[PDB]
Design an enzyme around this catalytic site. Structure first.
Site, PDB file in Angstrom:
ATOM      1  N   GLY A 217       0.794  -1.224   0.000  1.00 35.03           N
ATOM      2  CA  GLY A 217       0.000   0.000   0.000  1.00 35.03           C
ATOM      3  C   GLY A 217       0.829   1.278   0.000  1.00 35.03           C
ATOM      4  N   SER A 218       2.053   1.175   0.501  1.00 33.13           N
ATOM      5  CA  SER A 218       2.955   2.326   0.579  1.00 33.13           C
ATOM      6  C   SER A 218       3.885   2.426  -0.634  1.00 33.13           C
ATOM      7  CB  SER A 218       3.777   2.269   1.873  1.00 33.13           C
ATOM      8  OG  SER A 218       2.957   2.500   3.005  1.00 33.13           O
TER       9      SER A 218
ATOM     10  N   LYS B  11       2.663   3.251   6.992  1.00 37.06           N
ATOM     11  CA  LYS B  11       1.586   3.488   7.954  1.00 37.06           C
ATOM     12  C   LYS B  11       2.033   3.146   9.380  1.00 37.06           C
ATOM     13  CE  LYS B  11      -3.327   2.523   8.820  1.00 37.06           C
ATOM     14  NZ  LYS B  11      -4.540   1.808   8.319  1.00 37.06           N
ATOM     15  N   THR B  12       2.559   1.934   9.566  1.00 36.63           N
ATOM     16  CA  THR B  12       3.004   1.485  10.887  1.00 36.63           C
ATOM     17  C   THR B  12       4.365   2.027  11.288  1.00 36.63           C
ATOM     18  OG1 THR B  12       3.817  -0.564   9.845  1.00 36.63           O
ATOM     19  CG2 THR B  12       1.689  -0.666  10.822  1.00 36.63           C
TER      20      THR B  12
ATOM     21  N   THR C 118       7.199  -2.023   9.367  1.00 39.92           N
ATOM     22  CA  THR C 118       7.312  -3.078   8.350  1.00 39.92           C
ATOM     23  C   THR C 118       8.775  -3.420   8.055  1.00 39.92           C
ATOM     24  OG1 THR C 118       5.191  -2.420   7.408  1.00 39.92           O
ATOM     25  CG2 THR C 118       6.514  -3.797   6.060  1.00 39.92           C
TER      26      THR C 118
ATOM     27  N   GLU D  14      10.640  -4.848   5.653  1.00 38.06           N
ATOM     28  CA  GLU D  14      11.246  -4.499   4.371  1.00 38.06           C
ATOM     29  C   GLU D  14      11.569  -3.003   4.311  1.00 38.06           C
ATOM     30  OE1 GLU D  14       8.320  -7.878   3.036  1.00 38.06           O
ATOM     31  OE2 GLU D  14       8.463  -6.449   4.702  1.00 38.06           O
TER      32      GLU D  14
ATOM     33  N   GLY E 159      -3.962   0.840   3.685  1.00 47.85           N
ATOM     34  CA  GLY E 159      -2.774   0.979   2.855  1.00 47.85           C
ATOM     35  C   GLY E 159      -3.092   0.962   1.369  1.00 47.85           C
ATOM     36  N   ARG E 160      -3.930   0.013   0.968  1.00 50.91           N
ATOM     37  CA  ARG E 160      -4.318  -0.121  -0.433  1.00 50.91           C
ATOM     38  C   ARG E 160      -5.322   0.943  -0.898  1.00 50.91           C
ATOM     39  NH1 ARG E 160      -5.861  -4.292   2.713  1.00 50.91           N
ATOM     40  NH2 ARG E 160      -8.121  -4.566   3.020  1.00 50.91           N
TER      41      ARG E 160
ATOM     42  N   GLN F  37      -3.664  -5.767  -5.887  1.00 52.02           N
ATOM     43  CA  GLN F  37      -3.730  -5.538  -4.445  1.00 52.02           C
ATOM     44  C   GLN F  37      -5.073  -5.001  -3.983  1.00 52.02           C
ATOM     45  OE1 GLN F  37      -0.949  -2.826  -2.550  1.00 52.02           O
ATOM     46  NE2 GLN F  37      -1.709  -3.355  -0.510  1.00 52.02           N
TER      47      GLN F  37
ATOM     48  N   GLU G 244      -6.453  -8.130  -1.923  1.00 48.59           N
ATOM     49  CA  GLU G 244      -6.206  -7.974  -0.496  1.00 48.59           C
ATOM     50  C   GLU G 244      -7.458  -7.511   0.243  1.00 48.59           C
ATOM     51  OE1 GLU G 244      -2.141  -7.010   1.670  1.00 48.59           O
ATOM     52  OE2 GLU G 244      -3.319  -5.180   1.285  1.00 48.59           O
TER      53      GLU G 244
ATOM     54  N   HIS H  96      -0.908 -10.660 -28.529  1.00 54.49           N
ATOM     55  CA  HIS H  96       0.143 -11.505 -29.098  1.00 54.49           C
ATOM     56  C   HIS H  96       0.545 -12.632 -28.154  1.00 54.49           C
ATOM     57  CE1 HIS H  96       0.811  -8.645 -32.467  1.00 54.49           C
ATOM     58  NE2 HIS H  96       0.252  -7.835 -31.585  1.00 54.49           N
TER      59      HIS H  96
ATOM     60  N   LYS I 261       4.431 -13.529   8.270  1.00 52.19           N
ATOM     61  CA  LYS I 261       5.352 -12.650   9.004  1.00 52.19           C
ATOM     62  C   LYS I 261       5.880 -13.327  10.268  1.00 52.19           C
ATOM     63  CE  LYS I 261       3.354  -8.223   7.475  1.00 52.19           C
ATOM     64  NZ  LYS I 261       2.641  -6.987   7.953  1.00 52.19           N
TER      65      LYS I 261
HETATM   66  O1  LIG Z   1       3.138 -15.219 -31.253  1.00 56.15           O
HETATM   67  C1  LIG Z   1       3.483 -13.841 -31.082  1.00 56.15           C
HETATM   68  C2  LIG Z   1       4.404 -13.264 -32.105  1.00 56.15           C
HETATM   69  O2  LIG Z   1       5.695 -13.462 -31.570  1.00 56.15           O
HETATM   70  C3  LIG Z   1       4.088 -11.787 -32.290  1.00 56.15           C
HETATM   71  O3  LIG Z   1       2.826 -11.665 -32.927  1.00 56.15           O
HETATM   72  C4  LIG Z   1       5.134 -11.101 -33.173  1.00 56.15           C
HETATM   73  O4  LIG Z   1       5.209 -11.748 -34.442  1.00 56.15           O
HETATM   74  P1  LIG Z   1       6.348 -11.386 -35.379  1.00 56.15           P
HETATM   75  O5  LIG Z   1       7.654 -11.802 -34.775  1.00 56.15           O
HETATM   76  O6  LIG Z   1       6.099 -12.080 -36.692  1.00 56.15           O
HETATM   77  O7  LIG Z   1       6.345  -9.899 -35.591  1.00 56.15           O
HETATM   78  O1  LIG Z   2      -1.505  -3.946   2.985  1.00 59.09           O
HETATM   79  C1  LIG Z   2      -0.091  -3.832   2.876  1.00 59.09           C
HETATM   80  C2  LIG Z   2       0.588  -2.775   3.686  1.00 59.09           C
HETATM   81  O2  LIG Z   2       0.290  -1.571   3.007  1.00 59.09           O
HETATM   82  C3  LIG Z   2       2.103  -3.007   3.668  1.00 59.09           C
HETATM   83  O3  LIG Z   2       2.448  -4.133   4.461  1.00 59.09           O
HETATM   84  C4  LIG Z   2       2.901  -1.802   4.163  1.00 59.09           C
HETATM   85  O4  LIG Z   2       2.500  -1.430   5.471  1.00 59.09           O
HETATM   86  P1  LIG Z   2       3.068  -0.170   6.106  1.00 59.09           P
HETATM   87  O5  LIG Z   2       2.551   1.015   5.337  1.00 59.09           O
HETATM   88  O6  LIG Z   2       2.609  -0.130   7.539  1.00 59.09           O
HETATM   89  O7  LIG Z   2       4.573  -0.217   6.045  1.00 59.09           O
END
Ligand SMILES: O=C[C@H](O)[C@H](O)COP(=O)(O)O
Ligand SMILES: O=C[C@H](O)[C@H](O)COP(=O)(O)O
Lengths: 556, 556
Positions: free
Chosen positions: B158-159, B210-211, B214, B216, B271-272, B353, B357, B388, B518
């Site tokens: 969310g962040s 938010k918290t 987290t 990460e 967050g989301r 998300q 979520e 494609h 977690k």
């Molecule tokens: O199957 C997808 C093909 O790779 C895409 O349409 C591109 O084709 P091309 O390489 O003949 O341009």
């Molecule tokens: O729903 C996911 C939260 O947004 C994510 O874990 C980040 O949380 P935070 O904003 O508290 O760091």
């Protein structure tokens, strides 16, 4: 349809119906201390190991036996051998299927129409090697006599996503090399914002198109050429700044690129299996031909593993069989690819094409309409980000979603004495453990008691804190994401898709829905021109066209 | 579960059982010339039009009446009103759900615990505006006295996803703004590759959490600080290069950031649903505060549309209902978001998300387990690229996949006198037409005849070239993707998600499903240290750890 008529399939389906409700991952692990040992494959490539741990799956000894028997009964081994030997197994287009030839490092003959394809494969590779050296060294000069700083691949689908995904995944191997850009969408935004950041003097365009007639690619290429010539003002200069990758020499020449500035591939290279061919030129330019060769070599290693290993211990076969179990017995629509690797951020998207364009089919070799599921919807994002996006649903939704978790043991950036990667690994391991084990009401109850929750608050919260678990995963762990290992991993999934296709009796190697797509826009393009009302189509198409015409002039 | 015991739902199910097999899009259009007119909404926002064309869906007048009745009898109108009034509808966490307050441009009071939240919402926005003026003018100086050239958002989920998706979508509006970078993954690759391209003298880090706990984010933030201090040395100089966006003032100060450099939000901001708050700082810095206000205003417009419009012509309600129909009656696991717009390339991932979520849930307001499907797996990539690739499976696979096709009428880059956009539009229109109509045997056969196929070659190939069609889509077309229109579009899907959540009787606003992962990761983290075998888990987890310990010092 061949699959549902098969007695080994019928046996498997009947076993599932009678017994599947009794399979509980938690209990399978409790009952069998040797579960990991007996339901994993540790592959030594001699350039790193790849561990395929499929033990967190809703299977036991008898299920795997029945699955392997089904693969035998469906003639997987014979079909594989036919692919490798140059048989025209793409029966709707009457073509061989020879991406394995592209990376055939052993150089053993593979004949199409009585002729060994290896000399031409190797000739093109030699040409790629020479060109890469000339460009990367700075020897190759633009029209004002400056070295090339930017490579721009113009192509779509199979002529785009492979080179994109691989250059992203192998970014640390691109030191010294020129910048690489990927233009694909017809949406003018894509080429416009790319060109805005470039000089015609130092940009080399790679026009990647098997047919050299695809609308998006040719239009983009013409826009790039127009932009280039507005600055260069010399048609002779195009030879210094444009290279074609194609099978269609006539259309290349028609566009204005000379065959000497063309690197060829062949009809038996499917687009979504083309990064191994001339189409991989942007890879080789970006990371160097040496690393490109290592990529090919890893795929070759995996080709050999696929070719020579008995089915019951054959990595791509087992992945395919587990897929069949979830798709045709459990009815799971999707399969998630969750690489715990930021460089692999486009891996899931790549196999979203590779899998879905291959096995999104409903007609068999016999011409029968299938009466069973074929290819799944493939999706995903890298860990750990997905944990904060959609894992809520994987853990506590109403869908069964087989997931492959992938991670390298060694990181390309061991910053903070390895702290980030230790955390990354911990999450990778924890998530599949959590999906397997869950958390029982009694377990959740105890945590809430220890949290100091009153009886009333605890009882309201309790069911929301319960994790039902029993959610199956594969964990694929490899020494490091080197060019070689990445090559091996891509080939593994290619062969997974092959095995599933043969088992479903479909053609993994045509794409009539993609071909249909290329015919469709021509009928509408002319109607968008002018202020006239369109009454030609269904009322929706008509109404949308009317809205477009009405709104295109208004000044916001 | 409330939904399944609802008699209007049972009526809908029984109608589906009796009538859905013969429901054909072609026939619905042929029988009713007013179909587009009566199954679409043309919204005039006064800042562009949004056309929501739901006519290519497997519904008729009776189905839509039954669906609207279901919404009413599930309490959608009362629940909506409760959200807007600051009722604590996030019942598991006992919180208000007030992302609508964040963009409440009208400044109508909205009370939580007797106090209007608007004064504080506006104070933070005023501070956001001041930050933007200082940074974008160059008046905000780094530790050597130089203007900021690069902004780095550090946050996850969310962040991260909102600010990323919106800055990508509104890229044309970023002239004169600093470059913006997004770091989110714990994977050291993310911060390492970002920091390699930056100067500590001109880089401003924004720690979005938010918290503010987290793992990460806090880890990435500390790595960024460590990198900075290597250069600047002086711990007081940190204050010129770090800003925090959080609800936790105490944890922010502990990290070393003065409240002067903090922008606050509140617990009722999910967050989301957070991009509209202080979390949107990187958006406002990149495109300017005026464009950020336009984004908020667009959302506000859609909020008012949702609040005031009778259900049967209410855009987010109708989208929700069509989803309920496909999820709970047809059993479709997934929902594809397909913007024909390169700038919108992260829109599908954002709502992956926002949707999953929110609605990946299985416990109802009563505490009972659902005995029906809830949220779908959301996925997609921009057109035309999908045509494609995975469109092969949409056209010719064995899955029913509701798709939302989205496009602006006016492009940000009308290159080649609008040639690229004309082609893009034509593809947008032709694909939904073809998904509806398919291609008949009589049509395919003429193509094979013209290709000079023998009667026998024609007969074998024919079924492979036929397309059953009857694949339902929504087409969402808007004047131009401006900040305002983007804001309206995001809010529209936010409210779609809300309505589905209410109808399923689930809590769209908690996320208990992330807790177990977690918990298990914290236990594994220290176990990875040292050479000793780990045996505390199941054999798979133990075995994976063993492989990691064995492989981490292998030299390639
Ligand atoms: O199957 C997808 C093909 O790779 C895409 O349409 C591109 O084709 P091309 O390489 O003949 O341009
Ligand atoms: O729903 C996911 C939260 O947004 C994510 O874990 C980040 O949380 P935070 O904003 O508290 O760091």
């Amino acid at each position: 349809a061949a699959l549902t008529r098969n007695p080994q399939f019928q046996k498997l389906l009947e076993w599932h119906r009678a017994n599947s409700a009794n399979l509980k991952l938690r209990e399978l692990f409790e009952a069998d201390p040797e579960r990991f040992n007996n339901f994993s494959l540790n592959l030594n490539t001699n350039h790193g190991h790849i561990l395929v741990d499929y033990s967190k799956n809703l299977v036991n000894k008898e299920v795997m036996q029945m699955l392997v028997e089904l693969a035998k009964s469906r003639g997987v081994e014979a079909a594989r051998d036919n692919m490798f030997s140059g048989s025209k197994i793409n029966y709707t287009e009457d073509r061989a299927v020879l991406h394995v030839a592209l990376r055939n490092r052993s150089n053993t003959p593979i004949k199409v129409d009585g002729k060994d394809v290896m000399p031409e494969v190797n000739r093109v590779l030699d040409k790629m090697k020479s060109f890469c050296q000339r460009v990367r060294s700075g020897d190759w000069k633009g029209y004002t006599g400056k070295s090339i700083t930017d490579i721009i691949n113009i192509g779509i689908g199979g002529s785009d996503l492979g080179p994109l995904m691989v250059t992203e995944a192998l970014k640390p191997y691109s030191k010294g090399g020129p910048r690489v850009w990927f233009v694909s969408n017809i949406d003018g935004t894509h080429i416009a914002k790319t060109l805005a950041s470039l000089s015609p003097e130092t940009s080399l365009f790679i026009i990647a198109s098997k047919t050299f007639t695809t609308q998006e690619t040719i239009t983009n290429a013409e826009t790039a050429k127009e932009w280039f010539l507005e600055a260069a003002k010399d048609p002779s200069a195009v030879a210094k700044h444009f290279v074609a990758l194609s099978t269609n020499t006539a259309k290349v020449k028609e566009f204005g690129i000379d065959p000497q500035n063309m690197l060829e591939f062949w009809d038996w290279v499917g687009g979504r299996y083309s990064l191994w061919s001339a189409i991989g030129l942007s890879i080789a330019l970006h990371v160097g031909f040496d690393h490109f060769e290592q990529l090919l070599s890893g795929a070759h290693w995996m080709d050999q593993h696929f070719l020579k290993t008995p089915l019951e211990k054959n990595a791509p076969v087992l992945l395919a069989l587990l897929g069949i179990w979830y798709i045709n017995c459990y009815g799971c629509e999707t399969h998630a690819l969750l690489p715990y690797d930021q460089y692999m951020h486009r891996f899931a998207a790549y196999f979203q094409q590779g899998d879905m364009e291959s096995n999104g089919k409903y007609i068999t070799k016999s011409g029968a309409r299938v009466d069973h599921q074929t290819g799944p919807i493939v999706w995903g994002e890298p860990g750990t980000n997905g944990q904060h996006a959609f894992y809520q649903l994987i853990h506590q939704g109403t869908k069964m979603i087989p997931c492959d978790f992938l991670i390298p043991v060694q990181t390309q950036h061991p910053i903070r004495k390895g702290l980030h990667h230790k955390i990354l690994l911990a999450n990778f391991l924890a998530q599949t453990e959590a999906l397997m084990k869950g958390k029982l009401p009694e377990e959740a109850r105890k945590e809430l008691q220890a949290a100091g929750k009153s009886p009333e608050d605890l009882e309201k919260l309790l069911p929301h804190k319960v994790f039902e678990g029993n959610r199956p995963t594969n964990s694929i762990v490899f020494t490091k994401l080197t060019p070689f290992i990445l090559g091996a991993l891509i080939a593994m999934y290619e062969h997974k898709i092959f095995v599933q296709g043969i088992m479903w009796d479909i053609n993994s190697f045509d794409q009539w829905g993609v071909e249909l797509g290329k015919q469709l826009a021509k009928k509408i393009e002319p109607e968008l021109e002018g202020s006239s009302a369109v009454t030609s189509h269904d009322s929706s198409t008509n109404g949308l066209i009317s809205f477009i015409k009405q709104q295109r002039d208004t000044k916001l």
